[PDB]
């Protein structure tokens, strides 16, 4: 007779949390930013075209220099391109062809890879032999690896389908921190600008904000009706956007612990695969299954621009640190760079 | 023209990388990719052993053809998030144990293993990512079914069964019930083969099915329809 007591106590605590959230919502975001001038029409053109892939490209990440780019597809080879000259700087053969995530180290020395092999591979780029060697192989997960993000040259954050997140030490190869509490498979990660907190959305239509140095679940956000496939932190670290399969994106705040903005449209019935912000945080780029990407106004929830030119589902988006251009990778084995 | 010596050398390196990537792609595009599936204790391990962490790869060489089978065993997660990565395989091998016709799915929940296998089959068959991928069904463990038919009737899981306790018509009815789950019978073919614990003609049947699928694809893409 204790299980039902615990369940009713939990539901009472959830009702109290809901009441506390409702008692703090004075006005919506659409009422405070009503006097903000609209952005207008976003007209971006494809400047470069990176060819060479022969399979569906699943991941892509920009570096800290805003010049080099990394790309991963089902061919089983990482390709490091020079975005200014469209030249393939590096080609790294992989032991696993099913790659669904990749990461670029902030120093530019290491590259992460992962997929259905449940092992996170870290390869070193600057080697005295002039080639690429298998620097580290992190094992311990039983589900597919969905995202990879580097904190520094010694620590890495990974997410797997085991409803848990992990923080690994590169020098020791042991799981330093384990984040538990989710009920669905975590699909994406997002690091804070100060590398102190991180948000992770799962297939249970819910995201959780965790602390790195404590390993505890700080906050939890809900509101979606389908599985969340992408997530991205705000440039200032006080908000985050989530995209789900319900063709509706959401933008939550950290200090408010409530739903701040929602982006929906009747002519969109396709799920979201990638979500990213600009340098200023005014525009929100989201890739959908309608063979194109949509750039919405984060302050007015209006469609600011449409980026088309892909003949398949957009699988990954990327925005440089300085905000000079936006890279887009889809399953058509082609990478595009809009400016 | 307007590039320096280092820039020209970098362009040459990029061209060499492009050549290597194209060579690797042309070499890999000639191999056959098969997707292996099956429920628990359905004899998938026996099949992968006779024909020979996360996803397992298996390489076979038969009649100058290089088959690459993907075993997704021990991957207990939501398939709806990683099945689309297998869009484009040559065929889907699906292992089903007949002896599971009168056994529970590891729990006394009144759910027979045969019903769960039929549910998995009709879920992976009507999937949006495999609207034209052929399915090769392997019914394993018939050497035990031959004795289990004489100890337990088939009416335990199929109340509408109106036959006798013989292997031939029971296997035929099971094959018909498995094939009736395919809705799009025009753009999908289902190959059935009765396997046992000591069968050696599995690789030959797989090779024949792969050749048939290749012939059908060559008939389709060349415009002969």
């Amino acid at each position, epitope marked *: 007779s204790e299980l039902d007591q615990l369940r009713q106590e939990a539901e009472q605590l959830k009702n109290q949390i809901r009441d506390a959230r409702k008692a703090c919502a004075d006005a919506t975001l659409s009422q405070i930013t009503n006097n903000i001038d609209p952005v207008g029409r976003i007209q971006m053109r494809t400047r470069r075209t990176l060819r060479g892939h022969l399979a569906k490209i699943y991941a892509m990440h920009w570096g800290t220099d805003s*010049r*080099l780019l990394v790309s991963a597809s089902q061919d089983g080879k990482l390709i490091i391109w020079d975005s200014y000259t469209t030249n393939k700087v590096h080609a790294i053969p992989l032991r696993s062809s099913w790659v669904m995530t990749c990461a670029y180290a902030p120093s530019g020395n290491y590259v992460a890879c992962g997929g259905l092999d449940n092992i996170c591979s870290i390869y070193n780029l*600057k080697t*005295r032999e*002039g080639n690429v060697r298998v620097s580290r192989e992190l094992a311990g997960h039983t589900g597919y690896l969905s995202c990879c993000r580097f904190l520094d040259d010694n620590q890495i954050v990974t997410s797997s389908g085991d409803t848990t997140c992990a923080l690994w030490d590169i020098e020791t190869g042991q799981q330093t921190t384990t984040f538990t509490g989710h009920t669905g498979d975590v699909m994406s990660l997002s690091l804070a600008p100060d590398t102190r907190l991180f948000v992770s959305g799962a297939c249970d239509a819910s995201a959780k904000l965790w602390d790195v140095r404590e390993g505890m679940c700080r906050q939890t956000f809900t509101g979606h009706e389908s599985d969340i496939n992408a997530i991205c932190f705000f440039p200032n670290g006080n908000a985050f956007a989530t995209g789900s399969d319900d063709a509706t994106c959401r933008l939550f705040d950290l200090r408010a612990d409530q739903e701040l903005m929602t982006y929906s449209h009747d002519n969109i019935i396709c799920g979201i695969t990638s979500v990213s912000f600009s340098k200023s945080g005014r525009l929100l780029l989201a890739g959908y299954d309608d063979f194109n990407c949509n750039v919405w106004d984060a302050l007015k929830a209006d469609r600011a621009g449409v980026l088309a030119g892909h003949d398949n589902r957009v699988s990954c988006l990327g925005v440089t640190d300085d905000g000079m251009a936006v890279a887009t990778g889809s399953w058509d084995s082609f990478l595009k760079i809009w400016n | 023209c307007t590039l*320096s*010596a280092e*820039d020209k050398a*970098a362009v040459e390196r990029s061209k*060499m990388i492009d050549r290597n990537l194209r060579e690797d792609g042309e070499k890999a595009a000639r191999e056959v990719k098969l997707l292996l599936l099956g429920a628990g204790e359905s004899g998938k391990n026996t099949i992968v052993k006779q024909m020979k962490t996360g996803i397992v790869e298996t390489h076979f060489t038969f009649k100058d053809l290089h088959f690459k089978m993907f075993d997704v065993g021990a991957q207990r997660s939501e398939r709806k998030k990683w099945i689309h990565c297998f869009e484009g395989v040559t065929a889907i091998i699906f292992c089903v144990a007949l002896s599971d016709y009168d056994l529970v799915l590891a729990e006394d929940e009144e759910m027979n293993r045969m019903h769960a296998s039929m549910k998995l089959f009709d879920s992976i068959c009507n999937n949006k990512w495999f609207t034209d991928t052929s399915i090769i069904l392997f019914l394993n463990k018939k050497d035990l079914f031959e004795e289990k038919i004489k100890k337990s009737p088939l009416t335990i899981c199929y109340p509408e069964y109106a036959g006798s306790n013989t292997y031939e018509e029971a296997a035929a009815y099971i094959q018909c019930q498995f094939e009736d789950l395919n809705k799009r019978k025009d753009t999908k073919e289902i190959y059935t083969h009765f396997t046992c614990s000591t069968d050696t003609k599995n690789v030959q049947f797989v090779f024949d099915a792969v050749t048939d699928v290749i012939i059908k694809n060559n008939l389709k893409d060349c415009g002969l329809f």
Partner: single-chain antibody
Amino acid sequence: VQLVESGGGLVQPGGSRKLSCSASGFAFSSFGMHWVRQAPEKGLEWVAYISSGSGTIYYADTVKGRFTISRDDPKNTLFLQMTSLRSEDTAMYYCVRSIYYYGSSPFDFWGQGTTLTVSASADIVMTQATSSVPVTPGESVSISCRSSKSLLHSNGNTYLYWFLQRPGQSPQLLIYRMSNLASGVPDRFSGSGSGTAFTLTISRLEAEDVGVYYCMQHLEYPLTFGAGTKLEL
């Protein structure tokens, strides 16, 4: 990473000689190879260069037509055939490894070099004044360098290389790109400048940093080395 050369010795004038260089410790197929010559007058001079996969090969205007460089990839070897040897061929030959990509460090490893004795023009000109700089350890050193052509390319890069050669050893790369420290070199050395005027600054000088400092331009072939600035203890 190791390069070992062989095939030197004494040769009569007008004959021929086949020099060999073998590599060990790296992927030889992905690196370009340079053959450089050093006469007894302490002046460095580039002779030949071959890229990865033997695609593009460059020779010097003083040795074109007589020398032939070849690259055997399955054995990771570099051969150099030399016919019609003249009295000005008595020198030491070095093999240099050099890869070219964004962020790379070319000329990062120099071979041991073999000796060869023989008994008896829009090329950029690099000059180094003050051939002798006497200074005790502890004080800073400033080495100036000029050029006859602007090395600042349109891409914003400056193809200027600073090497150091110790007495009785092989030259070592100190600076590959302008204001960019190489690998294995301490942070005591620095380089700066612009246009056709550059400077190398050494702070907290030790006794182990004695040698000759050479400058090289890589804007266009052929590559020209400086006269050499000797650092006197």
